Design a protein around this ligand. Structure first.
Ligand SMILES: *[C@@H]1O[C@H](CO)[C@@H](O[C@@H]2O[C@H](CO)[C@@H](O[C@H]3O[C@H](CO)[C@@H](O)[C@H](O)[C@@H]3O)[C@H](O)[C@H]2NC(C)=O)[C@H](O)[C@H]1NC(C)=O
Ligand SMILES: *[C@@H]1O[C@H](CO)[C@@H](O)[C@H](O)[C@H]1NC(C)=O
Ligand SMILES: [Cu+2]
Ligand SMILES: [Cu+2]
Ligand SMILES: [Cu+2]
Length: 535
């Protein structure tokens, strides 16, 4: 490893913070079905926070002026409208990662909101229970917007999964674990990602926005919701007793990007790359009175990646395990979690997408996103199941690939270094898959249920910004209906950002009056954006 560049930090001295739950402002009755739609207001604004206790503070920009943004908790079947208000200094575009939103509510990179404007995002919340996350996607400034704080968690819940009796209680035994990797100046401010064209690895590991924290835990089971929200750093996570720091302790993975696995996957090492979500149950029962360190495999994630490793990037956080529990642990991890809704399999030859570099620019089949005339790389009729072959021929870089709209099954992985194939925790449904060194992955997806133009890209945010993103069009015929003509173009004027005055927001009047919000949402709802999922 390489010497740390950021100032020395007081390791494992600050408790793991938990982002607060985001509460809706009000609900609006949907005239179509008489259901309540939950309406939220999120203010994107600059803020500072004192990351290094004995230095200066860091400049950030976040949802509701915090990083991570607040955590949404939404039950399946409840539609939501979130008004993302830009009261900051650069444009934004919000992507709810994990949601089959319509194209104009999906965070298309050109679909920006300027400072002094807001955009209303209408979300369906119909998919399987899963850990989604919302984050910036504005063209060519995504890495810095995310880095400086525009990412938060969004939990879609299902009461039918209650009976599973998994470890529960947000911030109690259900713990968000948002990972980031950054670098700090000598006075404790952030080093900018601007100017970086290869990757911004970072030498300070954060969980939920906090460098190298600790958490006091009871000797029992916890559900951890891991999310790699870093700009460029991938992880190989493992747990180890501080008395045997090299010995990986077993745990279970219970969910991936799109929701629960069919069965828990017994795991001692969890590969997790940018934008991937995995939910883990760890049992601290056997480690009462010990300290368990969450660590990160070195040698560039054990040869799967190419990331630079530093003095302390092998460390994530510490769990200090109590002698005994306060209450008995009545939670379980069932052998059978759910039936996973895999798409009907196809034998058609996969579509092929090569992720590489064309000179300094990161590209897809030699194309960059700025190239408007060539960036639409696939037309797929709505309802088609397709396999895509995702190729990383290079040994010098890696790419976690995200395909919007869909959930996909990971069919195969080859490695030119023979390092791995499909992992056990990739057994279910995902929407990001890591192309490690010399890896080719085939995925299978139902391109459904909504027509429109959607993105796919590498989710290394440096690669993404420069310029590794393309589009596909999920297409329908002229007689399809469902108001498709106003929902296929992500830049559709009907759904564009709107200017606001700060005073009317603060006074909750005008555009922000109960009447105006109610009427705006009821009118949106009349277009019935998500009806095709209700067949
Ligand atoms: C993505 O695929 C869309 C189809 O799902 C496609 O939208 C379709 O575009 C065609 C051609 O512009 C439209 O066809 C008709 O449009 C006008 C209006 O009536 C007619 O005068 C024309 O002669 C033509 O027959 C379709 O109406 C339209 N379909 C929908 C549902 O909007 C998009 O163009 C594709 N997007 C990209 C970027 O390629
Ligand atoms: C399309 O939107 C219009 C305008 O809101 C609405 O009146 C109509 O019912 C919608 N039609 C469908 C098929 O969703
Ligand atoms: Cu994402
Ligand atoms: Cu990449
Ligand atoms: Cu994206």
């Amino acid at each position: 490893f390489v010497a740390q560049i950021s100032p020395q930090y007081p390791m494992f001295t600050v408790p793991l913070p938990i982002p607060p739950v985001k509460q809706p402002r009000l609900t609006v009755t949907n005239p179509v079905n008489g259901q309540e739609i939950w309406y939220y207001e999120v203010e994107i604004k600059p803020f500072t926070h004192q990351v290094y206790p004995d230095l200066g503070s860091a400049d950030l920009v976040g949802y509701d002026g915090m990083s991570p943004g607040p955590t949404f908790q939404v039950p399946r079947g409840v539609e939501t409208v979130v008004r993302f208000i830009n009261n900051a200094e650069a444009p934004n575009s919000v992507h709810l990662h994990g949601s089959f939103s319509r194209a104009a509510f999906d965070g298309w990179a050109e679909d920006i909101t300027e400072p002094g404007s807001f955009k209303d995002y209408y979300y369906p919340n119909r998919q399987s229970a899963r850990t989604l996350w919302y984050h910036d996607h504005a063209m060519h400034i995504t890495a810095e917007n995310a880095y400086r704080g525009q990412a938060g968690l969004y939990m879609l819940t299902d009461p039918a999964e209650d009976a599973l009796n998994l470890p529960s209680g947000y911030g109690e035994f259900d713990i968000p674990m948002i990972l980031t990797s950054k670098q700090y100046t000598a006075n404790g401010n952030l080093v900018t990602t601007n100017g970086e064209l290869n990757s911004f690895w970072g030498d300070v590991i954060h969980v939920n926005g906090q460098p190298w924290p600790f958490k006091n835990v009871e000797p029992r089971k916890y559900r951890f919701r891991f999310l790699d929200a870093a700009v460029s750093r991938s992880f190989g996570l493992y747990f180890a007793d501080t008395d045997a720091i090299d010995t990986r302790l077993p745990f279970k993975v219970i969910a991936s990007d799109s929701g629960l696995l069919e069965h828990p996957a017994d795991t001692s090492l969890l590969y997790i790359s940018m934008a991937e979500r995995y939910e883990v149950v760890f049992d601290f029962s056997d480690y009462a009175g010990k300290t368990i360190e969450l660590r990160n495999l070195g040698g560039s994630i054990g040869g799967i990646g190419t990331d630079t490793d530093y003095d302390n990037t092998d460390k994530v956080m510490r769990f200090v395990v109590a002698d005994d529990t306060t209450q008995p642990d009545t939670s379980v991890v069932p052998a059978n979690l759910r039936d996973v809704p895999f798409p009907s399999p196809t034998t058609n030859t996969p579509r092929q997408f090569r992720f590489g570099r064309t000179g300094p620019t990161w590209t897809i089949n030699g194309v960059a996103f700025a190239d408007v005339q060539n960036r639409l790389l696939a037309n797929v009729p709505v309802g088609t199941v397709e396999r895509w072959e995702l190729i990383n021929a290079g040994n010098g870089w890696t790419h976690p690939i995200h395909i919007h709209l869909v959930d996909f099954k990971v069919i195969s992985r080859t490695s030119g270094n023979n390092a791995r194939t499909v992992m056990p925790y990739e057994s279910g449904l995902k929407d990001v898959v890591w192309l490690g060194r010399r890896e080719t992955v085939v995925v299978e997806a139902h391109y459904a249920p909504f027509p429109g133009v959607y993105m796919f890209h590498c989710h290394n945010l440096i690669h993404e910004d420069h310029d590794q993103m393309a589009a596909f069009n999920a297409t329908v015929l002229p007689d399809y209906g469902y108001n498709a003509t106003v929902f296929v173009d992500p830049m559709e004027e009907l759904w564009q950002a709107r200017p606001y005055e700060l005073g009317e927001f603060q006074a909750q009047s005008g555009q922000f009056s109960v009447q105006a919000v109610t009427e705006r949402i009821q009118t949106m709802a009349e277009y019935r954006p998500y009806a095709a999922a209700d067949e």
